Amino acid sequence: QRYFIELTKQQIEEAPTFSITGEEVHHIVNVMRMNEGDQIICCSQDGFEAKCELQSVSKDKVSCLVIEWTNENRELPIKVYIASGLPKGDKLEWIIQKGTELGAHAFIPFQAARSVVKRERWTKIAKEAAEQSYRNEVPRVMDVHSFQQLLQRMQDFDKCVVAYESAFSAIVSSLPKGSSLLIVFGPEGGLTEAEVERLTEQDGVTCGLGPRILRTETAPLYALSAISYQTELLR
Amino acid sequence: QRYFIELTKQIICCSQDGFEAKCCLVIEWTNENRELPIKVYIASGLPKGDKLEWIIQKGTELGAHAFIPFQAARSVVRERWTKIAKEAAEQSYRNEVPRVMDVHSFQQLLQRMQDFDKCVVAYEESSAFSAIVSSLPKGSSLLIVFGPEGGLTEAEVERLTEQDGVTCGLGPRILRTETAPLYALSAISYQTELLR
């Protein structure tokens, strides 16, 4: 039902209809087997959502007519970046997937001291979650970062919370529309005393996320969900 | 290490009545309680694959008091579930092992709603969610209903509304069937524990 088009809103407005080429055609035509007259949801590269009607359906080209510009924006009011210490098994895919459903702006995996242990599949997982959750953007998944490299990234964001153990509601409720937030989590083992020390000197502020102990795949989910509650449900 | 034992009132032990202790010889009672201020019952329409296993686990680490699996209209569908709860309780330092009830039918779900202080239906047709949770007094009961993949059905919503459940959105992004309960629980801890 929902597709990310490699055109801008103004490029789609350009002509009377527009066409879909590549990966998506196959999904439209072969996998779903849609016919002319069928309706889909398209989001441009600049975040604009449209209701489209399949005017033409070929084997490599699909033509669409925009029947409505929804004006719907479902993006979190603030940019939240998830930094995760490489978890085991396939927990990173769950973090990326639910994370996108919950509004995360980008993911940054990093080698962590207790990390006991692909990106092309991660990018794919983020795009599909992005499609199924009606995001106006597809979250970017970065390259696995050394612990050091992560430390050098910190300067780019407005704030940084370190999930470790009540600054959290304060910082989140004091961030303005459009600002950036970095949240780093440790792996199954958890961040190290040494590691916290380096994060805290880079302005990272340690915060608890409730009194219950949360798994690595669970912590970021709580965090995104709380930000949503605060910035969208109360505000 | 932390283990649940059935007797009522080095490792950590937790009585059946919820009293945590450092120990066998009991050396000290911690006095620590990490349960949510309100009793939140998670009612989810039976999902596919192993999604309900996921909900039990994550939801126990996030404070669920109890789980009520039921047959939804769009549902295409116990001992293991209980085991997943207990282990999830163990690792997260809960004081209580949430119980997972027998799978109910929709009807059974409806007959059980009167028990609760407040019933929320995770659904939006139009959000009164923060208003409700912000207003439940400590110790009260909250049942939240969630559909399976595909969602609750309009017919179903109508009958839940006849029984006093209130429809409430959970933000503007479409959440999968296993993501919704984790959001609600997280939001709840945020309101009643981090803001309060």
GROMACS .gro file of C-alpha atoms in nm:
model
  431
    1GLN     CA    1   0.000   0.000   0.000
    2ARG     CA    2   0.270   0.261   0.078
    3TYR     CA    3   0.565   0.355  -0.140
    4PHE     CA    4   0.863   0.587  -0.124
    5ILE     CA    5   0.911   0.760  -0.460
    6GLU     CA    6   1.243   0.905  -0.582
    7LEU     CA    7   1.078   1.228  -0.699
    8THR     CA    8   1.014   1.554  -0.506
    9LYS     CA    9   0.661   1.687  -0.457
   10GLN     CA   10   0.730   1.960  -0.715
   11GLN     CA   11   0.871   1.706  -0.963
   12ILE     CA   12   0.551   1.498  -0.933
   13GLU     CA   13   0.337   1.809  -0.978
   14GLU     CA   14   0.541   1.881  -1.290
   15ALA     CA   15   0.329   1.661  -1.520
   16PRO     CA   16  -0.026   1.520  -1.513
   17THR     CA   17   0.082   1.168  -1.414
   18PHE     CA   18   0.411   1.017  -1.290
   19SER     CA   19   0.574   0.675  -1.325
   20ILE     CA   20   0.734   0.428  -1.090
   21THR     CA   21   1.053   0.254  -1.201
   22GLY     CA   22   1.269  -0.011  -1.036
   23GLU     CA   23   1.219  -0.229  -0.729
   24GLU     CA   24   0.872  -0.095  -0.655
   25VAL     CA   25   0.727  -0.178  -0.998
   26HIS     CA   26   0.797  -0.548  -0.933
   27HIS     CA   27   0.629  -0.520  -0.593
   28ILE     CA   28   0.336  -0.334  -0.750
   29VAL     CA   29   0.301  -0.556  -1.056
   30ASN     CA   30   0.433  -0.904  -0.971
   31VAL     CA   31   0.416  -0.943  -0.592
   32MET     CA   32   0.086  -0.762  -0.526
   33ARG     CA   33  -0.046  -0.788  -0.883
   34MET     CA   34  -0.232  -0.457  -0.897
   35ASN     CA   35  -0.439  -0.334  -1.190
   36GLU     CA   36  -0.523   0.003  -1.340
   37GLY     CA   37  -0.777   0.174  -1.115
   38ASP     CA   38  -0.606   0.042  -0.803
   39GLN     CA   39  -0.504   0.289  -0.532
   40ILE     CA   40  -0.175   0.329  -0.344
   41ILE     CA   41  -0.010   0.571  -0.105
   42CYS     CA   42   0.306   0.749  -0.216
   43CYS     CA   43   0.542   0.968  -0.020
   44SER     CA   44   0.793   1.191  -0.209
   45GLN     CA   45   1.161   1.229  -0.122
   46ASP     CA   46   1.082   1.554   0.063
   47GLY     CA   47   0.821   1.395   0.288
   48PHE     CA   48   0.499   1.476   0.099
   49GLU     CA   49   0.223   1.210   0.100
   50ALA     CA   50  -0.022   1.145  -0.181
   51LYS     CA   51  -0.313   0.916  -0.259
   52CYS     CA   52  -0.247   0.778  -0.607
   53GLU     CA   53  -0.447   0.584  -0.864
   54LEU     CA   54  -0.276   0.335  -1.098
   55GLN     CA   55  -0.344   0.476  -1.444
   56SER     CA   56  -0.094   0.247  -1.615
   57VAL     CA   57   0.054  -0.086  -1.507
   58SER     CA   58   0.329  -0.250  -1.715
   59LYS     CA   59   0.605  -0.502  -1.643
   60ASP     CA   60   0.871  -0.243  -1.565
   61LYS     CA   61   0.682   0.085  -1.555
   62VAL     CA   62   0.380   0.188  -1.347
   63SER     CA   63   0.197   0.514  -1.415
   64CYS     CA   64   0.013   0.705  -1.145
   65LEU     CA   65  -0.234   0.992  -1.115
   66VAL     CA   66  -0.234   1.180  -0.783
   67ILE     CA   67  -0.591   1.200  -0.656
   68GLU     CA   68  -0.513   1.379  -0.330
   69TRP     CA   69  -0.233   1.551  -0.134
   70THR     CA   70  -0.306   1.434   0.219
   71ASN     CA   71  -0.099   1.696   0.403
   72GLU     CA   72  -0.044   1.433   0.673
   73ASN     CA   73   0.275   1.451   0.875
   74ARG     CA   74   0.349   1.167   1.113
   75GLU     CA   75   0.706   1.253   1.205
   76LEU     CA   76   0.816   1.297   1.567
   77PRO     CA   77   0.857   1.667   1.654
   78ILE     CA   78   1.222   1.604   1.742
   79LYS     CA   79   1.501   1.408   1.571
   80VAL     CA   80   1.594   1.106   1.777
   81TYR     CA   81   1.908   0.914   1.706
   82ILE     CA   82   1.947   0.564   1.846
   83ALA     CA   83   2.301   0.448   1.921
   84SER     CA   84   2.310   0.075   2.003
   85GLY     CA   85   2.603  -0.136   2.127
   86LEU     CA   86   2.606  -0.430   1.883
   87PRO     CA   87   2.361  -0.681   2.035
   88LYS     CA   88   2.374  -1.056   1.974
   89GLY     CA   89   2.148  -1.281   1.766
   90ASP     CA   90   1.934  -1.062   1.543
   91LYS     CA   91   1.826  -0.801   1.803
   92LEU     CA   92   1.951  -0.515   1.587
   93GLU     CA   93   1.687  -0.586   1.321
   94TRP     CA   94   1.416  -0.574   1.590
   95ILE     CA   95   1.564  -0.249   1.718
   96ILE     CA   96   1.560  -0.102   1.365
   97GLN     CA   97   1.217  -0.227   1.281
   98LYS     CA   98   1.027  -0.126   1.597
   99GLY     CA   99   1.244   0.181   1.622
  100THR     CA  100   1.124   0.301   1.281
  101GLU     CA  101   0.760   0.218   1.369
  102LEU     CA  102   0.814   0.437   1.680
  103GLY     CA  103   0.956   0.741   1.498
  104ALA     CA  104   1.334   0.711   1.535
  105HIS     CA  105   1.524   0.944   1.301
  106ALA     CA  106   1.839   0.740   1.245
  107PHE     CA  107   2.031   0.443   1.384
  108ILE     CA  108   2.399   0.427   1.480
  109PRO     CA  109   2.536   0.082   1.572
  110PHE     CA  110   2.872   0.080   1.748
  111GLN     CA  111   3.125  -0.169   1.880
  112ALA     CA  112   3.092  -0.177   2.259
  113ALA     CA  113   3.332  -0.315   2.523
  114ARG     CA  114   3.084  -0.586   2.619
  115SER     CA  115   2.962  -0.640   2.260
  116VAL     CA  116   3.009  -1.017   2.230
  117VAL     CA  117   3.011  -1.003   1.851
  118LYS     CA  118   2.432  -0.677   0.717
  119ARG     CA  119   2.381  -0.302   0.676
  120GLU     CA  120   2.220  -0.362   0.337
  121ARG     CA  121   1.955  -0.575   0.508
  122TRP     CA  122   1.922  -0.317   0.787
  123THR     CA  123   1.845  -0.040   0.535
  124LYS     CA  124   1.587  -0.274   0.383
  125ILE     CA  125   1.428  -0.343   0.722
  126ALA     CA  126   1.401   0.029   0.792
  127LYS     CA  127   1.237   0.102   0.457
  128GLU     CA  128   0.968  -0.165   0.505
  129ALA     CA  129   0.895  -0.062   0.865
  130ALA     CA  130   0.885   0.289   0.725
  131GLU     CA  131   0.626   0.183   0.464
  132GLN     CA  132   0.406  -0.008   0.706
  133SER     CA  133   0.401   0.266   0.969
  134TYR     CA  134   0.325   0.557   0.739
  135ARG     CA  135   0.644   0.746   0.809
  136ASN     CA  136   0.712   1.053   0.591
  137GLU     CA  137   1.078   0.953   0.583
  138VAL     CA  138   1.294   0.639   0.590
  139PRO     CA  139   1.538   0.636   0.882
  140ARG     CA  140   1.905   0.612   0.793
  141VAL     CA  141   2.115   0.330   0.934
  142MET     CA  142   2.482   0.427   0.974
  143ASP     CA  143   2.796   0.216   0.955
  144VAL     CA  144   2.901   0.033   1.269
  145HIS     CA  145   3.098   0.284   1.472
  146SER     CA  146   3.399   0.219   1.689
  147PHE     CA  147   3.337   0.339   2.046
  148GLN     CA  148   3.580   0.623   1.972
  149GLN     CA  149   3.405   0.730   1.652
  150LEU     CA  150   3.075   0.754   1.835
  151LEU     CA  151   3.239   0.987   2.089
  152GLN     CA  152   3.335   1.221   1.802
  153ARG     CA  153   2.978   1.227   1.668
  154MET     CA  154   2.831   1.365   1.991
  155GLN     CA  155   2.915   1.726   1.908
  156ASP     CA  156   2.667   1.736   1.620
  157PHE     CA  157   2.357   1.693   1.834
  158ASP     CA  158   2.164   1.932   2.054
  159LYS     CA  159   2.157   1.681   2.344
  160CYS     CA  160   2.275   1.334   2.438
  161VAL     CA  161   2.118   1.097   2.689
  162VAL     CA  162   2.291   0.782   2.808
  163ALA     CA  163   2.048   0.507   2.911
  164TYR     CA  164   2.217   0.384   3.227
  165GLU     CA  165   2.152   0.375   3.601
  166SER     CA  166   1.567   1.122   3.625
  167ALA     CA  167   1.696   1.372   3.378
  168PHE     CA  168   1.496   1.207   3.100
  169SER     CA  169   1.155   1.376   3.125
  170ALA     CA  170   1.333   1.708   3.184
  171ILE     CA  171   1.560   1.691   2.882
  172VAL     CA  172   1.289   1.554   2.654
  173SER     CA  173   1.034   1.812   2.765
  174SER     CA  174   1.286   2.095   2.717
  175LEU     CA  175   1.376   2.013   2.353
  176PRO     CA  176   1.225   2.234   2.083
  177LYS     CA  177   1.056   2.137   1.757
  178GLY     CA  178   1.326   2.030   1.512
  179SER     CA  179   1.606   1.969   1.764
  180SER     CA  180   1.829   1.662   1.773
  181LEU     CA  181   1.867   1.397   2.041
  182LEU     CA  182   2.125   1.119   2.067
  183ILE     CA  183   2.048   0.826   2.300
  184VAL     CA  184   2.313   0.557   2.350
  185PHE     CA  185   2.239   0.210   2.486
  186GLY     CA  186   2.480  -0.068   2.589
  187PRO     CA  187   2.468  -0.433   2.477
  188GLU     CA  188   2.346  -0.737   2.675
  189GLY     CA  189   2.647  -0.690   2.901
  190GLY     CA  190   2.569  -0.317   2.931
  191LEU     CA  191   2.789  -0.008   2.900
  192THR     CA  192   3.107  -0.005   3.109
  193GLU     CA  193   3.210   0.231   3.391
  194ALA     CA  194   3.495   0.347   3.168
  195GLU     CA  195   3.257   0.403   2.875
  196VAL     CA  196   3.007   0.603   3.084
  197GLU     CA  197   3.293   0.825   3.198
  198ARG     CA  198   3.387   0.906   2.834
  199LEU     CA  199   3.023   0.965   2.737
  200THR     CA  200   2.963   1.193   3.038
  201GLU     CA  201   3.266   1.409   2.955
  202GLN     CA  202   3.127   1.450   2.602
  203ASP     CA  203   2.814   1.599   2.762
  204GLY     CA  204   2.626   1.268   2.767
  205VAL     CA  205   2.389   1.264   3.067
  206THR     CA  206   2.302   0.933   3.233
  207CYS     CA  207   1.930   0.864   3.275
  208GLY     CA  208   1.718   0.582   3.410
  209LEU     CA  209   1.421   0.463   3.200
  210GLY     CA  210   1.203   0.339   3.486
  211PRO     CA  211   1.289   0.109   3.778
  212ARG     CA  212   1.258  -0.213   3.581
  213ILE     CA  213   1.568  -0.353   3.406
  214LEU     CA  214   1.523  -0.352   3.028
  215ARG     CA  215   1.681  -0.566   2.756
  216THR     CA  216   1.889  -0.400   2.485
  217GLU     CA  217   1.616  -0.444   2.229
  218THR     CA  218   1.361  -0.308   2.482
  219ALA     CA  219   1.526   0.012   2.614
  220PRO     CA  220   1.511   0.218   2.293
  221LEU     CA  221   1.147   0.120   2.239
  222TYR     CA  222   1.045   0.258   2.578
  223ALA     CA  223   1.250   0.568   2.506
  224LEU     CA  224   1.090   0.639   2.166
  225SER     CA  225   0.744   0.563   2.302
  226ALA     CA  226   0.792   0.801   2.597
  227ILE     CA  227   0.911   1.081   2.363
  228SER     CA  228   0.598   1.029   2.155
  229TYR     CA  229   0.379   1.042   2.465
  230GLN     CA  230   0.537   1.366   2.581
  231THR     CA  231   0.578   1.554   2.253
  232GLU     CA  232   0.258   1.427   2.084
  233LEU     CA  233   0.003   1.299   2.342
  234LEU     CA  234   0.045   1.562   2.614
  235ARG     CA  235   0.157   1.840   2.381
  236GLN     CA  236   2.089  -1.369   4.053
  237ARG     CA  237   1.718  -1.339   4.129
  238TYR     CA  238   1.465  -1.618   4.179
  239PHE     CA  239   1.094  -1.634   4.258
  240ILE     CA  240   1.007  -1.874   4.543
  241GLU     CA  241   0.655  -1.967   4.657
  242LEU     CA  242   0.688  -1.932   5.032
  243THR     CA  243   0.548  -1.600   5.152
  244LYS     CA  244   0.738  -1.377   5.398
  245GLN     CA  245   2.470  -1.462   4.760
  246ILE     CA  246   2.148  -1.430   4.559
  247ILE     CA  247   1.823  -1.232   4.554
  248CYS     CA  248   1.490  -1.401   4.634
  249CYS     CA  249   1.133  -1.277   4.591
  250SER     CA  250   0.845  -1.418   4.793
  251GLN     CA  251   0.511  -1.511   4.636
  252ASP     CA  252   0.355  -1.203   4.797
  253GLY     CA  253   0.621  -0.978   4.643
  254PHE     CA  254   0.882  -0.920   4.912
  255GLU     CA  255   1.238  -0.905   4.778
  256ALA     CA  256   1.529  -1.034   4.989
  257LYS     CA  257   1.909  -1.062   4.977
  258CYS     CA  258   2.019  -1.411   5.083
  259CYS     CA  259   1.939  -2.020   5.236
  260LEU     CA  260   1.973  -1.743   5.490
  261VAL     CA  261   1.774  -1.419   5.466
  262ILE     CA  262   2.030  -1.147   5.534
  263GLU     CA  263   1.817  -0.843   5.445
  264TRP     CA  264   1.483  -0.728   5.309
  265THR     CA  265   1.549  -0.476   5.035
  266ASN     CA  266   1.212  -0.295   5.069
  267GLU     CA  267   1.230  -0.237   4.694
  268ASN     CA  268   0.924  -0.254   4.476
  269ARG     CA  269   0.951  -0.195   4.101
  270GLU     CA  270   0.591  -0.254   3.995
  271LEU     CA  271   0.390   0.011   3.812
  272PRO     CA  272   0.157   0.226   4.020
  273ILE     CA  273  -0.147   0.091   3.831
  274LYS     CA  274  -0.256  -0.261   3.733
  275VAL     CA  275  -0.237  -0.285   3.355
  276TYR     CA  276  -0.402  -0.582   3.186
  277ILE     CA  277  -0.289  -0.650   2.831
  278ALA     CA  278  -0.561  -0.798   2.613
  279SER     CA  279  -0.431  -0.885   2.270
  280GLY     CA  280  -0.607  -1.044   1.977
  281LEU     CA  281  -0.419  -1.365   1.897
  282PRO     CA  282  -0.141  -1.277   1.652
  283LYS     CA  283   0.056  -1.500   1.414
  284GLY     CA  284   0.388  -1.686   1.439
  285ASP     CA  285   0.541  -1.622   1.782
  286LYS     CA  286   0.429  -1.260   1.829
  287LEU     CA  287   0.241  -1.329   2.153
  288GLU     CA  288   0.562  -1.474   2.301
  289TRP     CA  289   0.726  -1.140   2.221
  290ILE     CA  290   0.439  -0.941   2.379
  291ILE     CA  291   0.455  -1.146   2.702
  292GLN     CA  292   0.828  -1.103   2.738
  293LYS     CA  293   0.863  -0.735   2.653
  294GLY     CA  294   0.539  -0.649   2.831
  295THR     CA  295   0.650  -0.820   3.152
  296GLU     CA  296   0.971  -0.619   3.148
  297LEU     CA  297   0.760  -0.307   3.094
  298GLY     CA  298   0.520  -0.362   3.385
  299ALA     CA  299   0.220  -0.562   3.260
  300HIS     CA  300   0.028  -0.700   3.556
  301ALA     CA  301  -0.134  -0.968   3.340
  302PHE     CA  302  -0.202  -1.086   2.986
  303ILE     CA  303  -0.536  -1.186   2.831
  304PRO     CA  304  -0.506  -1.347   2.488
  305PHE     CA  305  -0.839  -1.367   2.301
  306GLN     CA  306  -0.979  -1.475   1.967
  307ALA     CA  307  -1.023  -1.165   1.751
  308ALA     CA  308  -1.227  -1.147   1.432
  309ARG     CA  309  -0.909  -1.115   1.226
  310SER     CA  310  -0.726  -1.374   1.430
  311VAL     CA  311  -0.601  -1.665   1.220
  312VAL     CA  312  -0.566  -1.894   1.523
  313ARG     CA  313   0.021  -2.171   2.761
  314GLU     CA  314   0.283  -2.352   2.966
  315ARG     CA  315   0.555  -2.198   2.750
  316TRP     CA  316   0.390  -1.854   2.789
  317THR     CA  317   0.397  -1.881   3.167
  318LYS     CA  318   0.764  -1.979   3.145
  319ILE     CA  319   0.836  -1.674   2.926
  320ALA     CA  320   0.660  -1.452   3.184
  321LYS     CA  321   0.853  -1.586   3.484
  322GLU     CA  322   1.194  -1.559   3.314
  323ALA     CA  323   1.108  -1.208   3.192
  324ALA     CA  324   1.004  -1.125   3.547
  325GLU     CA  325   1.330  -1.269   3.680
  326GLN     CA  326   1.566  -1.067   3.461
  327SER     CA  327   1.378  -0.737   3.492
  328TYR     CA  328   1.356  -0.735   3.874
  329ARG     CA  329   0.978  -0.736   3.886
  330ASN     CA  330   0.834  -0.831   4.226
  331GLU     CA  331   0.551  -1.017   4.056
  332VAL     CA  332   0.523  -1.280   3.784
  333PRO     CA  333   0.241  -1.168   3.556
  334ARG     CA  334  -0.016  -1.432   3.482
  335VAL     CA  335  -0.127  -1.511   3.124
  336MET     CA  336  -0.494  -1.611   3.125
  337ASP     CA  337  -0.653  -1.883   2.919
  338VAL     CA  338  -0.731  -1.777   2.566
  339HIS     CA  339  -1.075  -1.617   2.584
  340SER     CA  340  -1.327  -1.576   2.305
  341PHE     CA  341  -1.449  -1.222   2.225
  342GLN     CA  342  -1.761  -1.282   2.437
  343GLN     CA  343  -1.557  -1.387   2.739
  344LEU     CA  344  -1.350  -1.073   2.685
  345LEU     CA  345  -1.669  -0.861   2.700
  346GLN     CA  346  -1.805  -1.028   3.014
  347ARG     CA  347  -1.474  -0.963   3.189
  348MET     CA  348  -1.465  -0.590   3.115
  349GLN     CA  349  -1.694  -0.490   3.405
  350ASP     CA  350  -1.423  -0.597   3.651
  351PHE     CA  351  -1.188  -0.318   3.549
  352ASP     CA  352  -1.177   0.040   3.667
  353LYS     CA  353  -1.119   0.163   3.312
  354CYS     CA  354  -1.112   0.006   2.968
  355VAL     CA  355  -0.917   0.150   2.675
  356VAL     CA  356  -0.954   0.029   2.318
  357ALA     CA  357  -0.642   0.081   2.107
  358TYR     CA  358  -0.811   0.216   1.800
  359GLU     CA  359  -0.881   0.551   1.637
  360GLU     CA  360  -1.178   0.631   1.408
  361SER     CA  361  -1.194   1.010   1.465
  362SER     CA  362  -0.693   1.109   2.198
  363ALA     CA  363  -0.829   1.061   2.550
  364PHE     CA  364  -0.538   0.824   2.648
  365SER     CA  365  -0.320   1.065   2.846
  366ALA     CA  366  -0.634   1.205   3.011
  367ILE     CA  367  -0.736   0.858   3.133
  368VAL     CA  368  -0.396   0.734   3.252
  369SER     CA  369  -0.313   1.065   3.420
  370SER     CA  370  -0.635   1.033   3.618
  371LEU     CA  371  -0.619   0.672   3.741
  372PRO     CA  372  -0.547   0.666   4.115
  373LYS     CA  373  -0.265   0.440   4.240
  374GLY     CA  374  -0.382   0.082   4.274
  375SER     CA  375  -0.650   0.106   4.007
  376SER     CA  376  -0.703  -0.139   3.723
  377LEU     CA  377  -0.662  -0.064   3.353
  378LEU     CA  378  -0.752  -0.304   3.070
  379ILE     CA  379  -0.620  -0.204   2.726
  380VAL     CA  380  -0.753  -0.392   2.418
  381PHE     CA  381  -0.542  -0.458   2.105
  382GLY     CA  382  -0.639  -0.625   1.775
  383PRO     CA  383  -0.423  -0.879   1.590
  384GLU     CA  384  -0.252  -0.816   1.256
  385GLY     CA  385  -0.510  -0.616   1.056
  386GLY     CA  386  -0.666  -0.469   1.367
  387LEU     CA  387  -0.983  -0.466   1.568
  388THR     CA  388  -1.297  -0.468   1.354
  389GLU     CA  389  -1.549  -0.184   1.350
  390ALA     CA  390  -1.813  -0.434   1.467
  391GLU     CA  391  -1.585  -0.535   1.755
  392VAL     CA  392  -1.511  -0.174   1.852
  393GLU     CA  393  -1.884  -0.103   1.871
  394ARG     CA  394  -1.941  -0.389   2.115
  395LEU     CA  395  -1.641  -0.284   2.325
  396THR     CA  396  -1.788   0.070   2.332
  397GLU     CA  397  -2.124  -0.070   2.442
  398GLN     CA  398  -1.932  -0.210   2.743
  399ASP     CA  399  -1.770   0.123   2.830
  400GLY     CA  400  -1.426   0.085   2.671
  401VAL     CA  401  -1.299   0.412   2.522
  402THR     CA  402  -1.124   0.427   2.186
  403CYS     CA  403  -0.782   0.593   2.203
  404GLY     CA  404  -0.508   0.641   1.948
  405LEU     CA  405  -0.145   0.564   2.040
  406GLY     CA  406   0.018   0.836   1.833
  407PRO     CA  407  -0.003   0.906   1.460
  408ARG     CA  408   0.225   0.622   1.338
  409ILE     CA  409   0.072   0.286   1.248
  410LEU     CA  410   0.202   0.038   1.505
  411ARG     CA  411   0.228  -0.338   1.437
  412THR     CA  412   0.033  -0.580   1.658
  413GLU     CA  413   0.333  -0.657   1.880
  414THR     CA  414   0.450  -0.295   1.902
  415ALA     CA  415   0.132  -0.139   2.037
  416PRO     CA  416   0.126  -0.287   2.387
  417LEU     CA  417   0.491  -0.192   2.437
  418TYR     CA  418   0.414   0.172   2.354
  419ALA     CA  419   0.113   0.187   2.588
  420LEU     CA  420   0.310   0.038   2.879
  421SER     CA  421   0.607   0.267   2.813
  422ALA     CA  422   0.385   0.574   2.797
  423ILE     CA  423   0.226   0.459   3.122
  424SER     CA  424   0.558   0.430   3.308
  425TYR     CA  425   0.652   0.770   3.167
  426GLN     CA  426   0.339   0.943   3.305
  427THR     CA  427   0.309   0.768   3.643
  428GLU     CA  428   0.678   0.714   3.719
  429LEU     CA  429   0.910   0.963   3.542
  430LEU     CA  430   0.681   1.266   3.547
  431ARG     CA  431   0.539   1.164   3.887
   0.00000   0.00000   0.00000
